[PDB]
Amino acid sequence: AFDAFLKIDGIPGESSDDKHKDWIEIQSFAHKHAAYEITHFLDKASPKIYEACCKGQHIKEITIELCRAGGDKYMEIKMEQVLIAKVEPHGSANDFPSEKVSFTYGKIKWTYTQQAGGGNVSSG
Amino acid sequence: AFDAFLKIDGIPGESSDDKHKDWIEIQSFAHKLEVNHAAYEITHFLDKASPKIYEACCKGQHIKEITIELCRAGGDVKYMEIKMEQVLIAKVEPHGSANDNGFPSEKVSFTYGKIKWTYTQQKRADGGGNVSSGWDLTANKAI
Amino acid sequence: AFDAFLKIDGIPGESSDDKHKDWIEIQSFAHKLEQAERVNHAAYEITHFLDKASPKIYEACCKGQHIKEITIELCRAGDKVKYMEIKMEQVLIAKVEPHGSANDNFPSEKVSFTYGKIKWTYTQQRADGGGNVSSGWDLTANKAI
Amino acid sequence: AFDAFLKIDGIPGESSDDKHKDWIEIQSFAHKLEQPAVNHAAYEITHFLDKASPKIYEACCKGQHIKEITIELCRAGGDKVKYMEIKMEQVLIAKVEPHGSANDNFPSEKVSFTYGKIKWTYTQQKRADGGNVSSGWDLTANKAI
Amino acid sequence: AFDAFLKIDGIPGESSDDKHKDWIEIQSFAHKLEQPVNHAAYEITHFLDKASPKIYEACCKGQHIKEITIELCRAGGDVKYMEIKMEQVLIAKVEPHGSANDNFPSEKVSFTYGKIKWTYTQQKRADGAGGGNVSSGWDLTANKAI
Amino acid sequence: AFDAFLKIDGIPGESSDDKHKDWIEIQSFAHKLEQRVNHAAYEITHFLDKASPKIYEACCKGQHIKEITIELCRAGGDVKYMEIKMEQVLIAKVEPHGSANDNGFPSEKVSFTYGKIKWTYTQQKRADGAGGGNVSSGWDLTANKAI
């Protein structure tokens, strides 16, 4: 299972999942110290994502979670003092069109939940 | 993919779609922002608009506004409208190859001055609304 | 999977097409028109199999032979459904690059064309319309045709 | 693929191998030895985000001097048969870099190690028809081991 | 694909083709010429063969070679369709490449010239062999035609 | 895919081949003689083997090595047809690389800075013996002239 979810504070989403309502569904996540990028389909959050990026709106917090279908969370990435740096909508054949949005920050926190036989291992 | 259509104010197309007669049929679109805004790139199979599109770029014709509409399948189900104003055809790159095994296409880029986005939601098995935003790139302060 | 054709004023080819007499059959084409200083018109790249025209095309580039006129046509496979005619004047072969590989099923060359005048002519064909929508540019005179 | 494992003394890992309990799993490595005009590069590995991940992010951002790190490349052959042993002393975790591409199934990262001493303990097989040829280099004194 | 063969003035090959004894068989060629006349290096790829060691020498030794000719053949007959004759030759760069996955290893060698001549032969049709020998040429030395 | 082998004088290998015992089996070779010729280096890639650890010493050692000879083989016997003897060599750059995904048995890319070289082809006849003799050539870049 992949089951990844992103909550952007300012912008609400369109996911209707069990653990993450009005979140945004993310089909790709990537990192680098520089920026954190994701890919998602064109949906509810996209127009308000552009505003923040162009506004260079100091954005407080963004969080990502990676759960599994079995017992519908194994990883949590938390980043503050965020700023959407760049978003790009593509679309050609097969694809639903998608866009890759990239976030910059001055602080970060990451949290793996190892099975608990390991409890919660975190970093920042 | 989807089912997308484009209206250039100055330059009409030749599609026979119902909701969009003589719009331009578009098979690829791409954009990127930062603000270091870029250009909305659209690709269309060589249509009747091509000759005038070429000249409009060369004439630097200020196109007042263009509208791109992406609709879903099982209907046209419009779900996003990109209305860009103060536009200008910047780079038109017509291409065509035998290995393409498709129609001679052509990518046209557009330097805009104002932009708008409009996500139309669906329902809730019974939902949602028209979430929007825009920039005034000519006064780098939102709408 | 298309049907494309090119004619060079001084250099003929070996097409067997009835309407295209002995023109040059092209297997790929490309162009780019960028941009308040001016507009960035690029070269018309045309790939075609090494043919009877190849030797003369080579010399023309090296000599800097200023050709008068060249034309491109695009037809569909009911055949002869011409849909696009590209005519350029005050032309000059800038670059020509032959290649081969003993793998791809025939060795071909790609010829680039710099011109001084251009003309596009789309023709549309269902109820038994559009005619010939057309355009050009006089880029020696920085004004349109 | 292979069966590779890594031990840093200060920070423990979470692997379950028979031969390597609570180690670090390494999915790629890379190193380079260049003789210009001698010059030593720095050691790369990949491992998943796990229990061991945070204590390096300290040594990266903090710069923690560590005693010894060791890599064991093992063959399959049922019981893992270690065929290469890399031992490095006077270590310092250099730049830490996390990457993840959402089609290699959870985030990953590339850690680079600097050292003052290296070791290579190659172990060969012989079936029924084997050897421990090794070497080392202490770059603190730029000499052999 | 195609069936191409290259004979340079001196170094012979190990090819056993009927039409070209001890020639060089070539699997790929490439050339470019651009009026700013800027010419480029004629390039070929061929396997490592009888010619191979004497090729590496003329490059470092700088040995001036009078003439090289290449012929391009279709399959089903080696009806020829192109003759490249180039005079005043010299090996510029040679690169023997060989891998396991990527085949028989090969070497891509690069040529400069002072004169060049092209000779296309048209397929015998019912109208005739046609252009027979359509040609053109250029003496880079005299920066003029041939 | 060929049958390639390398003889390093100092560092032994682990080939199980009958013609080249405890040699270096080679998976890829590369070279580039340009032109005032701009000579390069001989690159070859192979699996990590019994040669691997003593290769790192020879690189770091600045270790001047006298001779390496490498062979290329056909089938119909394991029949050598190219002998490349590089003289006054030196391991300039060696890069062990592992990746798992496409790295079954990791490999290393070792480059060799030679001072002299000697190519030696051996054409094989399709009759009694190996007609073709031993066409050969060579060069010495220390004194920047031929062999």
Evaluate whether chains E and A are touching (3 or more beta carbon pairs less than 8 Å apart). Answer: no
Of the candidates D56, D60, D43, the residue with the CA atom closest to the CA atom of residue D12: D56
Q: Most A CBs within 10 Å: which of D22, D96, D106, as the mutation test of the A interface?
A: D106
Distance in Å from the first CA to the final CA of chain F: 31
A32 C-beta neighbours (distance < 10 Å), count? 12
Number of H helices, E strands in chain A: 1, 9
Task: Kindly state the tokens that stand for F124.
Answer: 């094989």
Cα–Cα distances in angstroms (integers) from residue C41 to residues A109, B11, B59, C121, E38, in the given order:
51, 20, 12, 18, 22
For residue C100, how many other CB atoms are within 10 A of its CB? 24
Q: At CB < 8 Å, which residues of chain E contact C? A: 1-4, 26-35, 37, 39, 72, 81-82, 118-120, 122, 130-131, 134-138, 145
d(CA E12, CA F109): 34
- Distance in angstroms (rounded) separating the CA atoms of residues F96 and E47: 29
DSSP track, D103-143: S----EEEEEEE-SEEEEE-----TT-----EEEEETTTTE
State the burial class of residue C35 (Cβ atoms within 10 Å of its Cβ: 0-12, 13-18, 19+): middle
CA distance C54 to E122: 12
Documented resolution in Å: 3.3
Residue F45, SS3 per DSSP: strand
CB spacing of C106 vs E1 below 8 angstroms: yes
DSSP C145: -
CA D43, chain centre distance (Å): 7
Name chain A contacts of B113, Cβ cutoff 8 Å: none
**Contact criterion met (CB below 8 Å) for E23 and C85:** no
Helices (H), A1-124: 46-55
CB atoms within 10 A of CB C132: 11
Q: Which residue has the tokens 């592992």?
A: F98
What domain range includes position C80? Answer: 3-144
Please tell me the distance from the alpha carbon of residue D115 to that of residue D42, in angstroms, as a whole number: 8
Give the tokens for residue F37: 């010729």
**Smallest CA–CA distance from E139 into chain C, residue:** C62
Q: Which residues of D touch A (CB under 8 A)?
A: 14, 49-51, 53-54, 57, 97-103, 105-107
For position A94, which CATH number holds? 2.30.110.20
Q: What are the chain A neighbours of B132 within 8 Å (beta carbons)?
A: 47
Nearest to F16 by CA among F45, F43, F47: F47
- C76 and C123 in contact (C-beta within 8 Å)? no
Looking at the DSSP assignment, which residues form a beta bridge with residue D88?
D69
φ/ψ of A78, rounded to 5, equals: -120, 130
Measure CA of the first residue to CA of the last residue in chain D; give whole Å: 31
CA dist E18 → A50, A119, B8, D55, D118 (Å): 69, 77, 64, 72, 60
- Closest residue in A to D51 (Cα–Cα): A121
Q: Which residues of D touch F (CB under 8 A)?
A: 1-2, 4, 27-35, 38, 40, 73, 83-84, 118, 120-122, 124, 131, 133-137, 142, 144
- For residue F60, report the phi and psi dihedrals to the nearest 5 degrees: -65, -35
Neighbours of D78 (CB within 10 A): 6
User: Which among E21, E24, E7, E30 has a CA at the least distance from the CA of E106?
Assistant: E24
Looking at this protein, which amino acid is placed at residue D84?
Answer: M
How many beta-carbon pairs below 8 A join chains B and C? 89
CA distance E69 to E91: 14
CB within 8 Å: F2 and E52: no
Q: Considering Cα of B123, then B124, then B130, then B132, what sign does the dihedral take?
A: negative
Q: What are C72's two structure tokens?
A: 């491109």
Report how this structure was experimentally obtained.
Answer: X-ray
**Around Cβ B34, how many Cβ atoms within 10 Å?**
16
Beta strands in C77-116 (DSSP E): 81-100, 108-114
Map residue D59 onto helix, strand or coil: helix
The neighbouring-strand residues paired with E137 are: E117
Residue from D53, D62, D66, D65 nearest D97 by CA: D53
Closest chain C residue to B105, measured at CA: C30
CA–CA gap between residue F127 and residue F125 (Å, rounded): 5
Are F103 and D1 inside 8 Å of each other by CB? yes
Count of domains forming chain C: 1
Token duo for residue C73 = 């046509």
Residue F55 parent element (H or E)? helix F52-60
User: For residues C36 and B57, what is the distance between their CA atoms, to the nearest angstrom?
Assistant: 12
Q: How far apart, in whole angstroms, are the C-alpha atoms of residue C131 and residue B30?
A: 32
Characterise C25 by phi-psi region: left (phi > 0), alpha (psi -120 to 50), beta (else): beta
Q: How many Cβ atoms from other residues are within 10 Å of residue B130's Cβ?
A: 10
Name the residue facing C105 among E1, E26, E131 (closest C-beta).
E1
Q: Per the CB < 8 Å rule, is C33 touching B58?
A: yes
- Cβ-Cβ contacts under 8 Å, D131 against chain F: 50
Cα–Cα dist F114/F85, whole Å: 10
* Cβ contact A51:A11 at 8 Å: no
Choose among B47, B90, B96: nearest Cβ to C2.
B96
Whether F110 contacts F94, CB under 8 Å: yes
